[PDB]
Nucleic acid binder design. Sequence first.
DNA 1: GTGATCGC
DNA 2: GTGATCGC
Length: 64
Amino acid sequence: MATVKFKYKGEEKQVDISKIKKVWRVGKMISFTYDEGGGKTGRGAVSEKDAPKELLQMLAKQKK
DNA sequence: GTGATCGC
DNA sequence: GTGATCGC
């Protein structure tokens, strides 16, 4: 519902957090995948520092 | 290296 | 099997 903005292979992306498929923590990094067009899966990551709460709670609720 | 994945 | 990616 809210969005996450992140920079991936140069330049900024903004994705609806409803598209996020999987999220995991790597120390202070919040890493994820997300659904795109064409049946493809995108990757992105953000600092925990100001990560959207919607995304952080997904982390705490899944199941890897 | 780290966690996980894409895209070879 | 693995190189690049992401924040650190």
